Amino acid sequence: ALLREYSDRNMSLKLEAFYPTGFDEELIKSLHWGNDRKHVFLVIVKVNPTTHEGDVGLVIFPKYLLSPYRFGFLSHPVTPDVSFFDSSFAPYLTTQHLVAFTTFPPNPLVWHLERAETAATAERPFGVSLLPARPTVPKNTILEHKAHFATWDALARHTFFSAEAIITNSTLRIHVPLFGSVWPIRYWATGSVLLTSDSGRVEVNIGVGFMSSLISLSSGLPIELIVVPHTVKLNAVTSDTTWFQLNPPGPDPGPSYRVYLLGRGLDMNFSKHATVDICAYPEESLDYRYHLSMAHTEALRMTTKADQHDINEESYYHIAARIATSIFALSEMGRTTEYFLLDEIVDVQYQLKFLNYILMRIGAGAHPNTISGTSDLIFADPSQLHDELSLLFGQFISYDEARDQLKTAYALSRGQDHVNALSLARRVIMSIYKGLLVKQNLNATERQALFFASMILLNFSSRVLDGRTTLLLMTSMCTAAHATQAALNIQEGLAYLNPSKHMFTIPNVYSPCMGSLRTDLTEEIHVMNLLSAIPTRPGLNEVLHTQLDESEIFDAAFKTMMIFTTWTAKDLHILHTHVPEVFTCQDAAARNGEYVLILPAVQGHSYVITRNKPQRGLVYSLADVDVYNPISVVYLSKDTCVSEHGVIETVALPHPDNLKECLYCGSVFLRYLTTGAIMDIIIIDSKDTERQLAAMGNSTIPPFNPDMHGDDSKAVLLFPNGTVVTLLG
Amino acid sequence: QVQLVQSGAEMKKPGASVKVSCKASGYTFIGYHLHWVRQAPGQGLEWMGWINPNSGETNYAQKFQDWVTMTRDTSINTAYMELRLRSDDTAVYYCARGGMTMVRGVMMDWGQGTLVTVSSASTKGPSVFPLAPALGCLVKDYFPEPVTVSWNSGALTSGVHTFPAVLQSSGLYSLSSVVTVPTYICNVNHKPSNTKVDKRVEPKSCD
Amino acid sequence: DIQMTQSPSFLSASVGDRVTITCRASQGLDNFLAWYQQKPGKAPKLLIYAASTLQRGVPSRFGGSGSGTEFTLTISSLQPEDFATYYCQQLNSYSLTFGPGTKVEIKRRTVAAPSVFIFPPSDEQLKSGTASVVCLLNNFYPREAKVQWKVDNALQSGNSQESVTEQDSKDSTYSLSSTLTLSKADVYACEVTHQGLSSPVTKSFNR
Amino acid sequence: TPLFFGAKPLSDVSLIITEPCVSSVYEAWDYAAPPVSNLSEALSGIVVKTKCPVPEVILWFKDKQMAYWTNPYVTLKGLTQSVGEEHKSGDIRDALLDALSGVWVDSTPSSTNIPENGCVWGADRLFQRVCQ
Ligand SMILES: *[C@@H]1O[C@H](CO)[C@@H](O[C@@H]2O[C@H](CO)[C@@H](O[C@@H]3O[C@H](CO[C@H]4O[C@H](CO)[C@@H](O)[C@H](O)[C@@H]4O)[C@@H](O)[C@H](O[C@H]4O[C@H](CO)[C@@H](O)[C@H](O)[C@@H]4O)[C@@H]3O)[C@H](O)[C@H]2NC(C)=O)[C@H](O)[C@H]1NC(C)=O
Ligand SMILES: *[C@@H]1O[C@H](CO)[C@@H](O[C@@H]2O[C@H](CO)[C@@H](O[C@@H]3O[C@H](CO)[C@@H](O)[C@H](O)[C@@H]3O)[C@H](O)[C@H]2NC(C)=O)[C@H](O)[C@H]1NC(C)=O
Ligand SMILES: *[C@@H]1O[C@H](CO)[C@@H](O)[C@H](O)[C@H]1NC(C)=O
Ligand SMILES: *[C@@H]1O[C@H](CO)[C@@H](O)[C@H](O)[C@H]1NC(C)=O
Same domain, B115 and B27: yes
Chains touching B (at least 3 CB pairs under 8 A) are A, C, D
CB-CB neighbors (< 8 A) of C48 in chain A: none
CA of B188 to the centre of ligand 2 (A): 125
Measured distance CA(A290)–CA(A124) in Å, rounded: 15
Same domain, B36 and B114: yes
Measured distance CA(A602)–CA(A582) in Å, rounded: 13
- Looking at the DSSP bridge assignments, the partners of residue C115 are C138
- Looking at the DSSP bridge assignments, the partners of residue A80 are A185
Same domain, B144 and B180: yes
Closest residue in D to A175 (Cα–Cα)? D123
The answer to whether the CB of A169 is under 6 A from ligand 3 is yes
The answer to whether the CB of A399 is under 6 A from ligand 4 is yes
Q: End of a domain among B66, B98, B120? A: B120
Contact by Cβ (8 Å): A471, A600: yes
Q: Nearest C-alpha of chain D: how many angstroms from A256?
A: 27
Measured distance CA(A364)–CA(A371) in Å, rounded: 10
Q: Nearest C-alpha of chain B: how many angstroms from A236?
A: 10
Which ligand has the nearest atom to the CA of A445?
A: 4
Dihedral angle over CA of B157, B160, B164, B169, nearest 10:
-140
Measured distance CA(A635)–CA(A616) in Å, rounded: 9
Measured distance CA(A157)–CA(A178) in Å, rounded: 43
Cis peptide before B164 (omega within 30 of 0): no
Measured distance CA(A555)–CA(A539) in Å, rounded: 19
The answer to whether the CB of A136 is under 6 A from ligand 4 is no
Domain A589-728, architecture per CATH: Sandwich (2.60)
Measured distance CA(C144)–CA(C193) in Å, rounded: 8
Measured distance CA(C176)–CA(C196) in Å, rounded: 15
Which ligand has the nearest atom to the CA of A448?
A: 4
State the pairing for strand pair C102-107/C10-14: parallel
Based on the number of CB atoms within 10 Å of its own CB, is A491 exposed (0-12), middle (13-18) or buried (19 or more)?
A: buried
Please count the structural domains in chain B: 2
Closest residue in C to D100 (Cα–Cα)? C56
Measured distance CA(B144)–CA(A140) in Å, rounded: 93
Q: Domains of chain A: which residue ranges?
A: 2-66, 79-101+160-380, 589-728
Q: What is the DSSP letter of A368?
A: G
Q: How far is CA B87 from the centre of its chain?
A: 18
CB-CB neighbors (< 8 A) of B26 in chain D: 105-106
Same domain, B179 and B193: yes
Closest residue in C to D96 (Cα–Cα)? C56
Go through C97-115 and write b for each residue having 16 or more CB atoms within 10 A of its CB, e for each that does not: bbbbbbebbbebeeebebe
Dihedral sign of CA atoms C180, C185, C189, C191 in order = negative
CA nearest to A443, candidates A392, A349, A383, A511? A511
- CB proximity under 8 Å: C 91-120 to B: 91-101, 115, 117, 119-120
Same domain, B36 and B113: yes
Q: Does A108 touch chain B (CB under 8 A)?
A: yes
Contact by Cβ (8 Å): C190, C206: no
Same domain, B125 and B63: no
Contact by Cβ (8 Å): D70, D33: yes
Measured distance CA(B90)–CA(B146) in Å, rounded: 13
Q: Which residues contact B145 (CB under 8 A, 6 or more apart)?
A: B115, B117, B165, B173
Amino acid identity, residue B39? Q
Where residue B175 sits, what CATH number does that domain have? 2.60.40.10
Beta strands in A310-451 (DSSP E): 339-341, 372-377
Identify the three-state secondary structure at position A446: helix
Measured distance CA(A249)–CA(A617) in Å, rounded: 60
Domains and CATH numbers, chain C: 1-109 (2.60.40.10), 110-207 (2.60.40.10)
Q: How many CB atoms lie within 10 A of CB B155?
A: 8
Q: Does D115 touch chain A (CB under 8 A)?
A: yes
Are B138 and C117 in contact (CB < 8 Å)? no
Q: End of a domain among B120, B152, B178? A: B120
The answer to whether the CB of D117 is under 6 A from ligand 1 is no
Q: How far is CA A711 from the centre of its chain?
A: 45
Closest residue in D to C55 (Cα–Cα)? D101
Q: How far is CA A534 from the centre of its chain?
A: 30
Closest residue in D to B27 (Cα–Cα)? D106
Measured distance CA(A381)–CA(A561) in Å, rounded: 40
- Looking at the DSSP bridge assignments, the partners of residue D7 are D68
Helix axis angle for A399-411 and A419-438, nearest 10°, is 140
Q: Nearest C-alpha of chain A: how many angstroms from B35?
A: 16
Nearest to D50 among A46, A101, A214 (CB): A46
Measured distance CA(A639)–CA(B25) in Å, rounded: 80
CA distances from A600 to A461, B132, C94 (A): 14, 121, 66
- Is residue B109 within a helix (H) or strand (E), and if so which, with residue range? strand B107-110
Helix axis angle for A342-358 and A382-393, nearest 10°, is 100
Measured distance CA(C181)–CA(C156) in Å, rounded: 9
In chain B, % helix, strand, coil (3-state, to 5) comes to 0, 45, 55
State the pairing for strand pair A617-621/A643-645: parallel
Q: How far is CA B142 from the centre of its chain?
A: 16
Q: Does D50 touch chain B (CB under 8 A)?
A: no
CB-CB neighbors (< 8 A) of C57 in chain D: 98, 101
User: Is it true that A79-101+160-380 and A589-728 share their CATH fold?
Assistant: no
Contact by Cβ (8 Å): A177, A212: yes
Measured distance CA(A327)–CA(A291) in Å, rounded: 9
Dihedral sign of CA atoms A213, A217, A220, A221 in order = positive
* CA nearest ligand 1 atom 31, residue: A64
Contact by Cβ (8 Å): D39, D48: no
* CA nearest ligand 3 atom 5, residue: A169
When scoring C23, C96, C126 by the number of chain B Cβ atoms within 10 A, the one with the most, hence best to mutate, is: C96
- C-alpha gyration radius of chain A: 32
- Is residue A544 within a helix (H) or strand (E), and if so which, with residue range? helix A538-545
Measured distance CA(A12)–CA(A669) in Å, rounded: 97
Angle CA D15–D20–D23, to nearest 5: 140
Q: What is the residue-wise DSSP string for A46-115?
A: E--TTT---EEEEEEE-SGGGS-----SSSS--EE-SSSTTS--HHHHH--BTTTB-SS-S-GGG-BPPP
CA distances from A370 to A323, A365, A470, A599, A642 (A): 19, 11, 23, 26, 33
Strand order from edge to edge, sheet including C188-193: C146-148, C188-193, C202-205
Ligand 2 pocket test target in A607, A660, A723 with most atoms within 8 Å of CB: A723
Q: Does D97 touch chain C (CB under 8 A)?
A: yes
The answer to whether the CB of A67 is under 6 A from ligand 1 is yes
Ligand 4 pocket test target in A445, A447, A508 with most atoms within 8 Å of CB: A445
The answer to whether the CB of A145 is under 6 A from ligand 1 is no
Are B169 and C179 in contact (CB < 8 Å)? no
Angle CA A196–A199–A204, to nearest 5: 35
The answer to whether the CB of D89 is under 6 A from ligand 1 is no
Instruction: Report resolution (Å) to 1 decimal.
Output: 3.2
Q: End of a domain among B120, B148, B176? A: B120
The 8 Å CB, 24+ separation contacts for B179-184 are: B179/B134, B179/B135, B179/B136, B179/B151, B180/B134, B180/B135, B180/C115, B180/C117, B180/C138, B181/B134, B181/B135, B182/B134, B184/B135, B184/B151, B184/B152, B184/B156
* CA nearest ligand 4 atom 13, residue: A443
Method: X-ray
Dihedral angle over CA of A494, A498, A501, A502, nearest 10:
0
Q: What is the DSSP letter of A504?
A: -
Same domain, B86 and B108: yes
- Is residue A533 within a helix (H) or strand (E), and if so which, with residue range? helix A524-533
Dihedral angle over CA of C145, B157, C170, C143, nearest 10:
10
CA distances from A81 to A84, A176, A217, C97, D59 (A): 8, 10, 29, 34, 22
Are A242 and C30 in contact (CB < 8 Å)? no
Q: Nearest C-alpha of chain A: how many angstroms from B95?
A: 21
CA nearest to A82, candidates A174, A205, A190, A214? A174
CB-CB neighbors (< 8 A) of C49 in chain B: 99-100, 106, 108
Nearest to B45 among C1, C98, C166 (CB): C98
Q: Nearest C-alpha of chain B: how many angstroms from C116?
A: 10
Helix axis angle for A538-545 and A480-495, nearest 10°, is 60
Contact by Cβ (8 Å): D48, A45: yes
Q: How many CB atoms lie within 10 A of CB A85?
A: 20
Q: What is the residue-wise DSSP string for A121-163?
A: -SSSSS----SSPPPPPPTT---BSS----SSHHHHS--EEET
CA nearest to A527, candidates A565, A496, A492? A565
The answer to whether the CB of A69 is under 6 A from ligand 1 is no
Identify the three-state secondary structure at position D107: coil
Measured distance CA(A210)–CA(A187) in Å, rounded: 7
Same domain, B147 and B108: no
Same domain, B58 and B148: no
- Looking at the DSSP bridge assignments, the partners of residue C182 are C131
Q: Which residues contact A633 (CB under 8 A, 6 or more apart)?
A: A607, A608, A609, A619, A620, A621, A622, A670, A716, A718, A724
Phi/psi at A514 (nearest 5 deg)? -85, -20
Cis peptide before C8 (omega within 30 of 0): yes
Same domain, B13 and B113: yes
CB-CB neighbors (< 8 A) of D95 in chain A: 3, 21, 59, 61
Measured distance CA(A235)–CA(A262) in Å, rounded: 12
Q: How many CB atoms lie within 10 A of CB A36?
A: 12
* CA nearest ligand 4 atom 10, residue: A443
Contact by Cβ (8 Å): C3, C98: no
CB-CB neighbors (< 8 A) of C30 in chain A: 247
Q: How far is CA B80 from the centre of its chain?
A: 15
Query: Domain limits at B205?
Result: 121-207
CATH entry, A79-101+160-380, from 2.60.40.1930, 3.30.500.50, 3.30.70.1020, 3.90.1570.10: 3.30.500.50
Contact by Cβ (8 Å): A310, A365: yes
Q: Domains of chain D: which residue ranges?
A: 1-132
Strand order from edge to edge, sheet including D66-70: A14-19, A2-8, A55-61, A40-46, D43-49, D56-61, D66-70, D7-9
Q: Which residues contact A300 (CB under 8 A, 6 or more apart)?
A: A490, A494, A506, A509, A563
Q: How many CA atoms lie within 13 A of C170 on its CB side?
A: 7
Phi/psi at A269 (nearest 5 deg)? -50, -30
Q: Does A586 touch chain C (CB under 8 A)?
A: no
Identify the three-state secondary structure at position C164: strand
Same domain, B114 and B12: yes
Measured distance CA(A696)–CA(A699) in Å, rounded: 7
